[PDB]
Amino acid sequence: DLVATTEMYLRTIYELEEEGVTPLRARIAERLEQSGPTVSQTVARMERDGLVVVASDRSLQMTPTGRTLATAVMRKHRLAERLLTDIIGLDINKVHDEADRWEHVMSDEVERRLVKVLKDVSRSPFGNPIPGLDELGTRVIDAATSMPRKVRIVQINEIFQVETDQFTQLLDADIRVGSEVEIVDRHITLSHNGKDVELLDDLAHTIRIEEL
Amino acid sequence: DLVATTEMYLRTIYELEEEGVTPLRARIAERLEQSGPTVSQTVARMERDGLVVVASDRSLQMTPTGRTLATAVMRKHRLAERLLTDIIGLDINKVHDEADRWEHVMSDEVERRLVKVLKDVSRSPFGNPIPGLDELGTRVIDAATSMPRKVRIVQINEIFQVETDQFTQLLDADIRVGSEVEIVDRHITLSHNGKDVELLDDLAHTIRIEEL
Ligand code: NI
Ligand code: NI
Ligand code: NI
Ligand code: NI
Numbered sequence: 055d056l057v058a059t060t061e062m063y064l065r066t067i068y069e070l071e072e073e074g075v076t077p078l079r080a081r082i083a084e085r086l087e088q089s090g091p092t093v094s095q096t097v098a099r100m101e102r103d104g105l106v107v108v109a110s111d112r113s114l115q116m117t118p119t120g121r122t123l124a125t126a127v128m129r130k131h132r133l134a135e136r137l138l139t140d141i142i143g144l145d146i147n148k149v150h151d152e153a154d155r156w157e158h159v160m161s162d163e164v165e166r167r168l169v170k171v172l173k174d175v176s177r178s179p180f181g182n183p184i185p186g187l188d189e190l191g192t193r194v195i196d197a198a199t200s201m202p203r204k205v206r207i208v209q210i211n212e213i214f215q216v217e218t219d220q221f222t223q224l225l226d227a228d229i230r231v232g233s234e235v236e237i238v239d240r241h242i243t244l245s246h247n248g249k250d251v252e253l254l255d256d257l258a259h260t261i262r263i264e265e266l
Numbered sequence: 267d268l269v270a271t272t273e274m275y276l277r278t279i280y281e282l283e284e285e286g287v288t289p290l291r292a293r294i295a296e297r298l299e300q301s302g303p304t305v306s307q308t309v310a311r312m313e314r315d316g317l318v319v320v321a322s323d324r325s326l327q328m329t330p331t332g333r334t335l336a337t338a339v340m341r342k343h344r345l346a347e348r349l350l351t352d353i354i355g356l357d358i359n360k361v362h363d364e365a366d367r368w369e370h371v372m373s374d375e376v377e378r379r380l381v382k383v384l385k386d387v388s389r390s391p392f393g394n395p396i397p398g399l400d401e402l403g404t405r406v407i408d409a410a411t412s413m414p415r416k417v418r419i420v421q422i423n424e425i426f427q428v429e430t431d432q433f434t435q436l437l438d439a440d441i442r443v444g445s446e447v448e449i450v451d452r453h454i455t456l457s458h459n460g461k462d463v464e465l466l467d468d469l470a471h472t473i474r475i476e477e478l
Contacts, residue, residue, distance in 0.1 A: 141383065142380065142383060143379050144375065144379050145375070148375060152376060155371035156368065156371055158371075159364075159370075159371055161364055163356065163357070163360060164350070164354065167354045167355050168354065170355070171353065171355065
């Protein structure tokens with residue numbers, strides 16, 4: 055019982071972060087269709103197991119081990135969805151639910167085979183990047199990690215820019231003095247309410263952020 | 267926890283029958299690497315759930331519902347093994363263990379797709395017929411069912427036979443006055459210690475059996 059449950063809590067926190075939603079226990083209860091009390095019980099165990107910390111604001115911060123496990127479950131889940139759609143041909147309306155089960159029993163080595171056999175594993179069939187593939191086998195340029203983080207805009211410093219076409223991109227995605235997600239890819243891209251601005255490097259080095 | 271466990275007990279009983287072994291609780295404990303007491307506890311629940319009867323000789327007789335479920339789990343298991351070998355290309359030494367997990371989470375509709383996509387679903391990669399495909403979508407000729415049963419030879423009646431090449435087949439598979447398995451296929455075949463004699467109809471109507 056217990057292992058699949060933990061993984062589901064983890065993938066759900068992972069999911070909410072990808073969606074920009076604060077990982078709150080009531081948000082997890084609602085999404086998993088579980089009671090709040092029930093969720094509190096599992097989260098308590100997960101804290102005990104070192105997988106999550108409940109911050110003073112009641113959000114759930116996955117620890118590095120928790121996040122590794124979350125990432126793995128998300129990876130299996132999305133690879134299973136790929137397998138089910140691409141090869142098996144299961145009706146798309148059933149694919150998620152099936153992968154909801156298969157994600158807890160797919161081995162790493164099966165994953166590795168899927169990566170060999172599938173045409174593309176960039177994205178699930180539902181449009182989301184498949185993470186953790188590598189593991190399977192302050193200025194923005196300095197501050198971003200290979201792990202999504204929300205930060206606060208403290209300076210944009212347009213005045214120092216030569217290229218200006220991204221000024222309007224920033225205005226259109228609404229930040230100026232706000233709280234944005236930051237990541238390094240193949241680098242740097244910023245997000246704010248499901249609107250992404252992929253920064254060119256000159257901007258990535260002048261934009262400054264803080265926690266928080 | 268409980269559903270996968272029940273299915274495993276069921277597939278194991280199914281297995282022992284296919285192998286000609288009396289479904290004894292100590293044989294199930296040994297095969298599942300579970301304690302006897304532990305197995306007694308689950309079997310008791312399974313009796314309560316209507317899936318098995320413990321006969322006076324201590325063998326486990328699957329009820330019709332139990333057998334249907336056993337057959338389904340065996341089917342998913344073997345189809346999963348096919349999928350893993352044929353398409354996925356998982357190392358054959360890992361295929362069983364993986365299917366040991368996937369058998370408990372594969373839906374009927376995924377099965378139906380597998381039957382569409384796979385080259386042949388007659389047999390698992392380990393040489394055993396895949397059952398339950400139809401469900402997914404006394405003289406021997408009269409006594410045999412579409413379900414394996416052991417019976418006792420009461421008469422062979424060679425004297426009434428025109429064709430005699432199967433006389434030696436019977437002698438070679440060692441029966442004469444013994445306890446044999448009987449089944450109807452595409453009919454009738456008899457088995458005795460992993461030696462099969464597929465009867466021609468003239469013999470199937472003269473050979474007589476009893477319980478038991
Ligand atoms: Ni999904
Ligand atoms: Ni799941
Ligand atoms: Ni097997
Ligand atoms: Ni199993």
